[PDB]
Amino acid sequence: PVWTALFDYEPSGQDELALRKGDRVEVLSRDAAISGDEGWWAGQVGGQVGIFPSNYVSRGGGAPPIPPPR
Amino acid sequence: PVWTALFDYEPSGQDELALRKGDRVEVLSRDAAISGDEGWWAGQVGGQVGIFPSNYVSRGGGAPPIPPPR
C-alpha cells in the first residue's frame, strides 16, 4: 500500500512537509502524539520529512495496474 | 468532480493519451463505444485527446481541502 498526494500543499510552518500532486508520501506516523495535531500525519517525500494534512493524500498508487485489453 | 492519474501510463498506440501521476485528466467519455474498448476512457491532458486505461485514474481532485487546525 502507498499514499499519493492528490493536492499541492505549501508549508505555513517550518515543520510542515510540502506536497505536490502525485507525490508518493511515505507515511511515518498517523499518531497525533508525534505530529502534534489531530488530522496531521508525519511523512516523507523524497528526502524531506515533516507533517502534512492527512486529507491531502489518498491510499492508492504503488504498482501500476495491468491495463485492460485492446 | 475531478479525475487524477494515480500512476504513470506510457502510450503503446497512436490514439492513447500519456498520463503522469498527479495529472488532472478531463474525462470526455467513459463509453466503450467511443473509446473502442471496455475499461478504456477518452480524455484530455495537456491539450491532447485520446484514450487511457480507466484503472489509472481516481475521482478526486478539485479544490484543495481545508487543512486541520494546528
Residue numbers in the entry:
A (entry chain B), B (entry chain A): 44 to 113
Study authors write:
MLK3, also known as MAP3K11, is a serine/threonine protein kinase involved in regulating the JNK, p38, and ERK pathways. It is composed of several modules: an SH3 domain, a kinase domain, tandem leucine zippers, a Cdc42/Rac interactive binding (CRIB) motif, several linker regions, and a proline-rich C-terminal tail. The SH3 domain has been implicated in the autoinhibition of the kinase domain through an intramolecular interaction via a nonconsensus single proline motif located between the leucine zipper and CRIB motif in the full-length MLK3 protein. The overall structure reveals a five-stranded antiparallel β-barrel, a characteristic of all known SH3 domains, and three loops (RT, n-Src, and 310 helix), commonly involved in the recognition of both proline-rich and nonproline ligands.
